[PDB]
Amino acid sequence: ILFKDDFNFFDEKVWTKETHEPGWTNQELQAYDAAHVSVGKDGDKSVLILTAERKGNKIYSGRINSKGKKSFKYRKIEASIKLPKTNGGLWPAFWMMGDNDKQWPACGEIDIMEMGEQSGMAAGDSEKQVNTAIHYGPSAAAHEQQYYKANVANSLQDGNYHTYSLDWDENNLTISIDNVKFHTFDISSNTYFHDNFYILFNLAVGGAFTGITDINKLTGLKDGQKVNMYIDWVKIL
Ligand SMILES: OC[C@H]1O[C@@H](O[C@H]2[C@H](O)[C@@H](O)[C@H](O[C@H]3[C@H](O)[C@@H](O)[C@H](O[C@@H]4[C@@H](O)[C@H](O)O[C@H](CO)[C@H]4O)O[C@@H]3CO)O[C@@H]2CO)[C@H](O)[C@@H](O)[C@@H]1O
Numbered sequence: 001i002l003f004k005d006d007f008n009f010f011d012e013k014v015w016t017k018e019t020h021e022p023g024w025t026n027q028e029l030q031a032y033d034a035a036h037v038s039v040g041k042d043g044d045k046s047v048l049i050l051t052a053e054r055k056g057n058k059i060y061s062g063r064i065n066s067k068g069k070k071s072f073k074y075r076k077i078e079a080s081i082k083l084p085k086t087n088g089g090l091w092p093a094f095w096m097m098g099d100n101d102k103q104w105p106a107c108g109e110i111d112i113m114e115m116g117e118q119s120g121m122a123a124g125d126s127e128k129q130v131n132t133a134i135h136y137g138p139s140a141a142a143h144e145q146q147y148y149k150a151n152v153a154n155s156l157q158d159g160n161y162h163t164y165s166l167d168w169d170e171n172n173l174t175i176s177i178d179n180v181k182f183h184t185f186d187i188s189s190n191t192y193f194h195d196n197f198y199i200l201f202n203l204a205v206g207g208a209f210t211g212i213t214d215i216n217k218l219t220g221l222k223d224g225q226k227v228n229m230y231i232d233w234v235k236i237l
């Protein structure tokens with residue numbers, strides 16, 4: 001183990017909490033703020049907690065990153081995550097961007113796990129449909145992306161913690177879920193995935209990815225509701 005965070009506390013030398021207005025990216029409905037990121041207990045576990053809540057028409061959630069604090073290259077990274085039921089517009093993600101000052105997508109982006117996609121609800125598989133992706137290219141105008149979408153065998157939104165893994169070498173990005181290989185992206189000739197990347201976790205609410213960009217269509221977080229995304233640990237081997 002090169003690095004482990006067991007989330008016994010919020011380590012400010014490793015993580016930064018993000019603050020953003022609603023609609024900052026992807027037509028998302030939440031504001032991100034520091035108050036919606038915490039570390040606390042989930043029974044016997046100590047966990048990172050991203051909390052999405054809705055107060056009338058205002059939605060708040062949490063997002064963190066390790067940019068300029070912890071980054072790596074060509075290692076396996078694994079995280080143990082418990083997800084809320086996403087149906088109706090929640091959008092959790094565990095992902096990475098290049099730890100450099102290039103403007104997205106030129107920094108490079110690896111989406112290890114995303115759930116909540118519009119097509120997942122449309123196929124009645126919202127608890128099982130996972131998206132993994134890579135985005136890259138020199139500018140927003142020249143944004144390229146490769147995606148893989150499929151259903152895992154069992155619900156990932158079942159009240160238990162599940163393991164999401166990235167194995168990374170100079171040729172391949174391999175995503176696994178509960179030790180079952182999900183997809184491999186070939187990056188052997190892709191210049192964007194050969195430098196250090198930092199880690200992100202977030203719980204977005206609505207957004208283009210979900211198909212839900214109008215708060216009136218947001219059934220997955222009703223007025224007065226709070227929902228939590230939990231990360232027991234993250235480690236890099
Ligand atoms: O500095 C100039 C300008 O920056 C503005 O914010 C930018 C930010 O710099 C940029 O990194 C951000 O990029 C986001 C993309 O717009 C968004 O599409 C992408 O979404 C990703 C998906 O690609 C991925 O599949 O899944 C993840 C997880 O679900 C998802 O979030 O995310 C990138 C990274 O956040 O765009 C911002 C808005 O343009 C500032 O707001 C502005 O003041 C500055 O002038």
Ligand SMILES: [Ca+2]
Binds near residue numbers: 007046047
């Ligand atoms: Ca823990």
